[PDB]
Symmetry: C3
Subunit: 102 residues, 3 copies
């Protein structure tokens, strides 16, 4: 099992898996930090809008009152954030596919 985290749904919080050495670092409800460079699959389920942040940037927007994430290249210190404007049919996580170069 690769390095992977999930957060949610409540009141389960941040579950880590193959943590040693870490690839991700929880930092809040719905926010975590990238400890290692790589290719990451982000996923989840969101049960007026939701936005998915890679640090400063809205990489998804979920503007229906659905699935979340996709695949990205990420680097030490990138934060990923799932922001809200019914939180138990809601969760996201991330799995680390590979570490190329760049």
């Amino acid at each position: 099992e690769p390095c992977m985290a999930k957060f949610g749904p409540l009141p389960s919080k941040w579950q880590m898996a193959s943590s040693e050495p870490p690839c991700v670092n929880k930092v809040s409800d719905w926010k975590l930090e990238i400890l290692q460079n790589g290719l990451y699959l982000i996923y989840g389920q969101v049960a007026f809008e939701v936005r998915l942040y890679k640090n400063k940037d809205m990489i998804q927007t979920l503007t229906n009152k659905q699935n979340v994430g996709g695949t990205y290249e990420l680097h030490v210190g990138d934060t990923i954030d799932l922001i809200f404007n019914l939180k138990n049919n809601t969760y996201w996580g991330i799995i680390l596919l590979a570490n190329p170069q760049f």
Copy 2:
């Protein structure tokens, strides 16, 4: 890695790295999940008009992807936590669409949570 694939027709269900098996088929287009895991679903609808145009993807009773057409070719699936006992299926409003059309599944990971 445990995986499967339906179609495109005349091929029916095909199964890769079993033992232990992660999924089992129900009928054409419908499969069952025999274990908990993080799964990646994929495939593609080849569009090819008396009924409205639609295909949907279900987990259990929940439509989880609606592919309301652009009668172009569109990706099926996405990433999902699935449980022993779920069933995934792909439903045609009518049979319309073509047969460069298939959908398949692969189990990425099965962690405790």
Copy 3:
């Protein structure tokens, strides 16, 4: 872990290595598939119309909804993917079971 990435410019093709090569650069934004398997294609159109193609068929188009490109497909030897504009993308080989 067979993979490759084209942008973002002026980086061009960037390929990690691999037991046997699963992929070969054809030219900018375009690659050819050298082995059957399941692949995950990814990228970002940059935080108009962009389009992903497998051979002659268009499999995704971006145009401000909300996105990054790609998805997961079963690709075959001799297939090609490009991205056309009218930003980077990459591919990884997830698997390649005997049923291709």
